[PDB]
Amino acid sequence: MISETIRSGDWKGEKHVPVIEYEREGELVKVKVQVGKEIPHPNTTEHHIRYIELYFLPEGENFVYQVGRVEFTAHGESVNGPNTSDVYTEPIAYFVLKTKKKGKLYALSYCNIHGLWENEVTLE
Amino acid sequence: MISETIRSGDWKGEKHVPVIEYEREGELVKVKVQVGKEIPHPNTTEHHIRYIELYFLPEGENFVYQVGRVEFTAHGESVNGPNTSDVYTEPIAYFVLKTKKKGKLYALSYCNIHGLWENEVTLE
Amino acid sequence: MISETIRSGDWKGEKHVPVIEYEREGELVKVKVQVGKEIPHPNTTEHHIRYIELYFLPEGENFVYQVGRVEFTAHGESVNGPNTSDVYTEPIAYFVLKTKKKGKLYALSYCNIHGLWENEVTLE
Amino acid sequence: MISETIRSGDWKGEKHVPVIEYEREGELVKVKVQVGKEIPHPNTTEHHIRYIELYFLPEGENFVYQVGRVEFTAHGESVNGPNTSDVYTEPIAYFVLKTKKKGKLYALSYCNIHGLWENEVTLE
Ligand SMILES: [Fe+3]
Ligand SMILES: [Fe+3]
Ligand SMILES: [Fe+3]
Ligand SMILES: [Fe+3]
């Protein structure tokens, strides 16, 4: 099972667990997901967070919906060598979801050398 | 040339042109891109905005860097038919870029039935 | 845990399970992944396979690597209505991996209305 | 205009140009796209091809359709340093398109340090 490759708890020293925060404004749900809130995770050409995906399983339903996916594609690479571009995309994802349902939000994160990471929160 | 398929000007009645706004906070550049700010573009199972991509060409350089890509993946589809899930991802993209450079920001947008759309702004 | 939303099963009985096949040619590993090999899966504007992702966990290592991702983006939509374009992308993915390692290959599939599906095979 | 950042050229002389080949089998169109067919392109942690996208503009129509997107995500990175994993995804993309239409096929390629590249062929 692929779940055997997904981690949900950080080790001390490096933050990989996606942190999910959301605000409900009417039928609009603004979701912020980020890796390394307190202690930033490295963002270099050889070690960086590649993307964050958000899923939503509505209360009482059987199928999860992928809500969105954000790819962080610049990590300092340039013709002048690794970490020389001065262009870096930080692992902060924002999603605006339109729904009146409640349920579970799941975030999936991938570090290029540290595998898959997950987290979830209850959408009320 | 693929540019022959990309549009940069809306026709009256439907907004496709990605609108780019940004705020510079130190070395952090917070970029917001959205389709249909004033008049929302439809978001249905048969007609919706699929994604928004952001590119950055630094001043005086020769190669553009893709900064990020955001996919809006929920458009009301469910086992109960099109437009029945009550789960929709709005075409609003937020990117946090770390750079001290200046240059040109380009946004690329795709409507599932109306092709590719582009816009650009100067990052100062 | 997100694994609670991922389904698996026999591909000879469940049309959603990604079927993984591979051929090793020197240091090159040609991997073919497909949904609906036995029982074809629908490909319509309202119901279709969105993408297939391939992961590789080398023997004896602790972190899985995402090998590739393929998005199937055309499902008949057009200005003339759903299922009118006559352009459909079939859920068949090919990956050419360069490695001498052995381990486990995992495939992850997403149906727009039937959630996430997984499968895995041993890479010899 | 974004086209000012996209390059094209002869694939027999420029290693970045995506080479498009296809075979029509009934209503099925098997498309193979690859970068570095003539002159291999590097695939290292600091310099590699990130993805290949395929578009199709049917004859006589006004809107291009994105047919598919393939991301090559492994480029040797590991906890042991750049280029140490022995896992590399080669920039070879395959797409199986179902259509009876004719038109133009466009491929878009991105090198992490050499920007965007394009190519096109006529689908008969
Ligand atoms: Fe890490
Ligand atoms: Fe539209
Ligand atoms: Fe299905
Ligand atoms: Fe290059």
Q: Where are the domains of chain B?
A: 1-124
- Closest C-alpha to B90, from D63, C69, A97: A97
The verdict on whether D102 is a catalytic residue reads no
- Helices assigned H by DSSP within C12-77: none
CA proximity to B42, closest of D109, A122, C77? C77
Cα of D15 from ligand 4 centre, angstroms: 8
Distance B76 CA to ligand 2 centre (A): 16
Q: Which residues, numbered 73 to 92 in chain B, qualify as contacts with chain D under a Cβ-Cβ cut-off of 8 Å?
A: none
Mutating which of A1, A2, A33 best tests the C interface, going by the most C Cβ atoms within 10 A? A2
D78 min Cα distance to partner chain A (Å): 5
| Domain A1-124: CATH superfamily, name plus number | SOR catalytic domain (2.60.40.730)
CA–CA distance, C118 with A21 (Å, rounded to integer): 28
Q: Is D48 annotated as a binding residue?
A: no
Q: Is D45 on the interface with A (CB under 8 A)?
A: yes
State whether B78 and C50 contact (CB < 8 Å).
Answer: no
Q: Region of D5 please: left (phi>0), alpha (psi -120 to 50) or beta.
A: alpha
Query: Quick check: is B15 catalytic?
Result: yes
CB B83 within 8 A of CB B76: yes
Residues of C in contact with A120 (CB under 8 A): 1-2
Do D85 and D108 touch, CB atoms closer than 8 A? no
Q: Do C77 and B46 touch (CB under 8 A)?
A: yes
The catalytically annotated residue of B32, B77, B114, B118 is B114
Closest C-alpha among A89, C7, C96 to residue B53 = A89
Q: Say if D106 is an interface residue toward chain B (CB within 8 Å).
A: yes
Long-range contacts of B76-80 (CB under 8 A, 24+ apart): B76/B43, B76/B44, B76/B45, B77/B45, B77/C46, B77/C47, B77/C112, B77/C113, B78/A63, B78/C113, B79/A63, B79/C113, B79/C114
Nearest-Cα distance to chain D for A23, in Å, is 32
Torsion angle of the four alpha carbons C19, A61, B49, A91, in this order, in degrees rounded to the nearest 10: -80
Give the separation between CA D88 and CA D116, rounded to whole angstroms: 21
Experimental method: X-ray
- Copy the structure tokens of residue A15: 């933050």
Nearest to D46 among A47, A73, A77 (CB): A77
From CA B25, how far away is CA B97, in angstroms rounded? 10
Coil vs helix vs strand at D3: helix
Distances (CA, A) of C56 to B25, C95, C102, D85: 39, 12, 9, 11
| Contact: B115, D64; criterion CB under 8 Å | yes
**What number of helices (H) and strands (E) belong to chain B?**
0, 9
Active site residue B16: yes
If DSSP codes are grouped into helix, strand and coil, which group holds residue D104?
A: strand
CA distances from D70 to A18, A25, D67, D73, D87 (A): 25, 36, 10, 9, 17
Question: Is B50 in the C-facing interface, judged by CB distances under 8 Å?
Answer: yes
Q: Is residue B114 less than 8 Å (CB to CB) from chain C? A: yes
Neighbours of C8 (CB within 10 A): 16
Task: Give resolution in angstroms.
Answer: 2.0
